[PDB]
Design a protein around this nucleic acid. Structure first.
Ligand code: MG
Ligand code: MG
Ligand code: MG
Ligand code: MG
Ligand code: MG
Ligand code: MG
Ligand code: MG
Ligand code: MG
Ligand code: MG
Ligand code: MG
Ligand code: MG
Ligand code: MG
Ligand code: MG
Ligand code: MG
Ligand code: MG
Ligand code: MG
Ligand code: MG
Ligand code: MG
Ligand code: MG
Ligand code: MG
Ligand code: MG
Ligand code: MG
Ligand code: MG
Ligand code: MG
Ligand code: MG
Ligand code: MG
Ligand code: MG
Ligand code: MG
Ligand code: MG
Ligand code: MG
Ligand code: MG
Ligand code: MG
Ligand code: MG
Ligand code: MG
Ligand code: MG
Ligand code: MG
Ligand code: MG
Ligand code: MG
Ligand code: MG
Ligand code: MG
Ligand code: MG
Ligand code: MG
Ligand code: MG
Ligand code: MG
Ligand code: MG
Ligand code: MG
Ligand code: MG
Ligand code: MG
Ligand code: MG
Ligand code: MG
Ligand code: MG
Ligand code: MG
Ligand code: MG
Ligand code: MG
Ligand code: MG
Ligand code: MG
Ligand code: MG
Ligand code: MG
Ligand code: MG
Ligand code: MG
Ligand code: MG
Ligand code: MG
Ligand code: MG
Ligand code: MG
Ligand code: MG
Lengths: 271, 27, 46, 94
RNA sequence: GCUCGCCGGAAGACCAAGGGUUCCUGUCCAACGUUAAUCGGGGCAGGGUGAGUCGACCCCUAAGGCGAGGCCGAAAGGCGUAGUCGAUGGGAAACAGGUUAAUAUUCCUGUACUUGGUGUUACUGCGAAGGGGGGACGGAGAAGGCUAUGUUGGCCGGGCGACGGUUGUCCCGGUUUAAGCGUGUAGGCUGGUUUUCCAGGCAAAUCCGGAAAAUCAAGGCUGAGGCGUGAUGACGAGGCACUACGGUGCUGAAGCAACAAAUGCCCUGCUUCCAGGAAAAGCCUCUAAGCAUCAGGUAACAUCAAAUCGUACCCCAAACCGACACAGGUGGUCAGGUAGAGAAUACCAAGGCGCUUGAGAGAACUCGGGUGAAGGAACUAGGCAAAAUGGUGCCGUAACUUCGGGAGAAGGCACGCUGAUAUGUAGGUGAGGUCCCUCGCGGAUGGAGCUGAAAUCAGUCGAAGAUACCAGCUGGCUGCAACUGUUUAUUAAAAACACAGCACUGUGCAAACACGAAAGUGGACGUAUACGGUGUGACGCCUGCCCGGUGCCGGAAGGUUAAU
RNA sequence: AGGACCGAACCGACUAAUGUUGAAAAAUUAGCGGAUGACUUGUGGCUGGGGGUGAAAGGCCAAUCAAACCGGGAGAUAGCU
């Protein structure tokens, strides 16, 4: 539920919360946690590789089953939890043999439902079965690219992938970007859309709400000196040049894909 | 002490002087 | 005002000490220069 | 068992002082200048053997050497070690 | 030595870092000390730092470093696995009193505690580099229960007043006591217990987790404080004696209660929110190979051991960083009284200082302040600076608005003391007493005593009652920027940057991109509701025409065109 | 509840005066802003010079920055003084 905040202060004037009351108001399941130390956008050389990253609230990592290998064994959904590491809510499930895991929560999933992976799985939202077992025209998520590697596609809050075709070993997918991609037909996929679809409906309201998320401020390039940026300089506001990166690469329109390895898997690019 | 003189010279010039004291560009 | 030397022996020895000099190649060349010049105190290290 | 040669090289000298005279007459404790590497057990064995007297406990401290100036040339005296040796009651020593 | 003045959330006390003998005693005054110096953080000599419990070391790990092999690289070398280092964090245990010229939770007295050993005695499943549990964790807020501590009363000892009065509703001082051990309270959490089974926890498992069934609602965990003991003790105002007048010795009264009360404790709690809040060991437990009555395990008792290093002194400073005995800078801990909302401010206590040149005189001028006739911004670039306002409670308060604000709008009234209501009220606290009880740190009742606002009425004093310190000037028009923030350390704090938001565009994951000759790493343990770049810069109404130029995208028939 | 309000600690540095061989190689006095947050602070760590970092002033990188410091090429060159 999106909740517009009352303007008792600037910084709450434009805030839209996304309140989900079904989430567990307690600590997460401890065995599935691990340390996630922050980086600052800095590599093993210590240099900043990707900018604007730093700070933010401390976050513990939740181990999430993307491979989804507990085949045949049904699992009931114990509770839904918040994951700070990602946009989608996660579900704590309990298998029959006593194993608990975290999965990505689908859209209509609630506490108490039964899910089941494997080939002999039914077709309801939550189940995971190979796309040679999945009917054409269905929306799936958490899609593997390679078999047994784990789901890599459609993991964000409201996403889904349509299955448009199948030719033997391959199925053709309609990705959320509009790209049509071939995937092997033995790769697992999970039924239904991912949960928190109204995640993009939030408004942070203020700058601190981005600093909570570790997003340091972005200096636009023309507000600099020419040694710093190509856009920099001018006596006033001057920009008489084509828009480039900080490293002198055209941004407005210039393509950067240079993978001739995966071009056979791309049916059509996005438009 | 010319060593305390070393201090004297080494850094009564490294004090660096502040600067001219008339905001005048004779421009 | 706050001046530029705020001492700490631990940081002094980790940064400029003997084993920090002997760790790397260039640090070993420093000790060879100071022995050749004939320094009494070869390093910081007491 | 500590060897007798080490026990003979542990003790250096008695330390005469007002605090030493007080501790000798009140707490029955002698104050010794000992070798620097000497431990408390080595001291207790040495006093129990070379003086033939019963040691209750040994307290130790390290004396830092002073920095002196002979003429105008700087110099530093040696660090030495000091032992408060508490004898049992009734025991006596010169 | 007597006065005076200053700090007193410090200009007092304890530490860390850092320094490194500056500590104490004797002696000296050449130099140092912004003067003299008999003095000194100065010179010279001597002395002084005592730990099983404090800290370090040590066991454990974080960020991160190193890194066998390894991968990569002209060489040097780079990264990094197993590992091994690395605190600022986790991990056993001691308190009170006395004492030195100088050390003390270290010595002494008293009373404790912890972990390892060996050794007997009983008992008998022991065992890990492995499994599980625990350690183990956020912000804010609300109270409640307490204590530290303070005040008053009581008690004891002393006093009866340099000047009117003061045997009393008078004055002064004291009224301290720990760790530990026992009790397990206010209060918080939790359903217990038994049996059977089980694709899980890399194998196993009696453990955890999960399925069943039965029985019992009542067991368990945690837990400040209190009480008792510790303690017939110690301390104790004072006295009694000697006195090197410094001291040392002996003796020693009362040692209670009520109220108020923390930012400290219960509280690593409870509630709530979103931005979703370290690890590992110690500890507990489970079994594996192994061992089979041996080894080992816990239980008691005894005994032994607990090493080594630091400990002096300054530590918001004359001892640290500033070249100085420099108006600078420096992290943590303690937090008395009166007034006060208060850690502000004023005066004081404990305690510590009077800032290492003074003496005069009382010109101009300068510095920092005080007051000012009449006028009241006429000054000036400009009301710069000054002056003024200033508190609590109540009344009342405009345009406009994003309906929150504006707004403390503006403006105004009251404010002291005494008495009465009421010899001190409402309220708070809560005793005795009585009753009940599955009986205790219990439950009712009860109201003593203590504490104690605020209001009204009457009176009264002064020029003035928020009397001192403290403590908003206000309003009107308008430009810019939405806002809070940031910035040129050392002439620029702004209209500049950032910002939430908007849009374009790239990117399908071995992502783009970026650092790297490379390996690799970040992005990201993320996957297009994501990430990067660019521009704009809340919100509201909007964002029009031009693709000729320059770019970019798409095209591939033709022309031209490289190495070969 | 709040990048909410007033306001000490704390952080900062808007104005004026002093001072300018200073008490001080940027401070004092009187006022000033924020003051539960994009806060601040201790300890330790990492990023290295055409490189870092930068809420971007060409700011900061040991009182030094339109390319640090030290040593070396090196007695650079100097139609200039
Ligand atoms: Mg960015
Ligand atoms: Mg932006
Ligand atoms: Mg920007
Ligand atoms: Mg600029
Ligand atoms: Mg350029
Ligand atoms: Mg222009
Ligand atoms: Mg133009
Ligand atoms: Mg002892
Ligand atoms: Mg010691
Ligand atoms: Mg005097
Ligand atoms: Mg005073
Ligand atoms: Mg000396
Ligand atoms: Mg002295
Ligand atoms: Mg002396
Ligand atoms: Mg003289
Ligand atoms: Mg003199
Ligand atoms: Mg001296
Ligand atoms: Mg340890
Ligand atoms: Mg590591
Ligand atoms: Mg390495
Ligand atoms: Mg190697
Ligand atoms: Mg280690
Ligand atoms: Mg530590
Ligand atoms: Mg002392
Ligand atoms: Mg474990
Ligand atoms: Mg927390
Ligand atoms: Mg009390
Ligand atoms: Mg009188
Ligand atoms: Mg009289
Ligand atoms: Mg009294
Ligand atoms: Mg007790
Ligand atoms: Mg001390
Ligand atoms: Mg002090
Ligand atoms: Mg002085
Ligand atoms: Mg000073
Ligand atoms: Mg006070
Ligand atoms: Mg004050
Ligand atoms: Mg005068
Ligand atoms: Mg005046
Ligand atoms: Mg006048
Ligand atoms: Mg007048
Ligand atoms: Mg005029
Ligand atoms: Mg005028
Ligand atoms: Mg003014
Ligand atoms: Mg004024
Ligand atoms: Mg105008
Ligand atoms: Mg602004
Ligand atoms: Mg600043
Ligand atoms: Mg800054
Ligand atoms: Mg400036
Ligand atoms: Mg300024
Ligand atoms: Mg990668
Ligand atoms: Mg702009
Ligand atoms: Mg346009
Ligand atoms: Mg065009
Ligand atoms: Mg083209
Ligand atoms: Mg605020
Ligand atoms: Mg000021
Ligand atoms: Mg404020
Ligand atoms: Mg410029
Ligand atoms: Mg500088
Ligand atoms: Mg350079
Ligand atoms: Mg250059
Ligand atoms: Mg040459
Ligand atoms: Mg030359």
């Amino acid at each position: 539920a999106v909740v517009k905040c009352k303007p008792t202060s600037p910084g709450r004037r434009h805030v839209v919360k996304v309140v989900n009351p079904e989430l567990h108001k307690g600590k997460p399941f401890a065995p599935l946690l691990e340390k996630n130390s922050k980086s600052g956008g800095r590599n093993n050389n210590g240099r900043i590789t990707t900018r604007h990253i730093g700070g933010g609230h401390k976050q513990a990592y939740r181990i999430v089953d993307f491979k989804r290998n507990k085949d045949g064994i049904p699992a009931v959904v114990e509770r839904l939890e918040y994951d700070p590491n990602r946009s989608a809510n996660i579900a704590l499930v309990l298998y029959k043999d006593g194993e608990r895991r975290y999965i990505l929560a689908p859209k209509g999933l609630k506490a108490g439902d039964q899910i089941q992976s494997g080939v002999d799985a039914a077709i309801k939202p939550g189940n995971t079965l190979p796309m040679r077992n999945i009917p054409v025209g269905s929306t799936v998520h958490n899609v593997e690219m390679k078999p047994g590697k784990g789901g890599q596609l459609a993991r964000s809050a409201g996403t889904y992938v349509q299955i448009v075709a199948r030719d033997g070993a391959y199925v053709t997918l309609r990705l959320r970007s509009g790209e049509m991609r071939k995937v092997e037909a033995d790769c697992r996929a999970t039924l239904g859309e991912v949960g928190n679809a109204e995640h993009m409906l939030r408004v942070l309201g203020k700058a601190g709400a981005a600093r909570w998320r570790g997003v340091r401020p972005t200096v636009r390039g023309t507000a600099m000196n020419p040694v710093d940026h190509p856009h920099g300089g001018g006596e006033g506001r001057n920009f008489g040049k084509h828009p480039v990166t900080p490293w002198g690469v055209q941004t407005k329109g210039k393509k950067t894909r240079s993978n001739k390895r995966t071009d056979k898997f791309i049916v059509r690019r996005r438009s | 002490m010319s060593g305390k003189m070393t201090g004297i010279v080494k850094w009564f010039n490294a004090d660096k002087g502040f600067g001219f004291i008339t905001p005048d560009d004779g421009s | 005002m706050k001046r530029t030397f705020q001492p700490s022996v631990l940081k002094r020895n980790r940064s400029h000490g003997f084993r920090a000099r002997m760790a790397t190649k260039n640090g070993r060349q420093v000790l060879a220069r100071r022995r050749a010049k004939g320094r009494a105190r070869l390093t910081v290290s007491k | 068992m500590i060897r007798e040669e080490r026990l003979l090289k542990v003790l250096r000298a008695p330390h005469v002082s007002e605090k030493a005279s007080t501790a000798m007459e009140k707490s029955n404790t002698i104050v010794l200048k000992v070798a620097k590497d000497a431990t408390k057990a080595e001291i207790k064995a040495a006093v129990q053997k070379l003086f033939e007297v019963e040691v209750e406990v040994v307290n130790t401290l390290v004396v830092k050497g002073k920095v002196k100036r002979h003429g105008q040339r700087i110099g530093r005296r040696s660090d030495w070690k000091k032992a408060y040796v508490t004898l049992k009651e009734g025991q006596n020593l010169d």
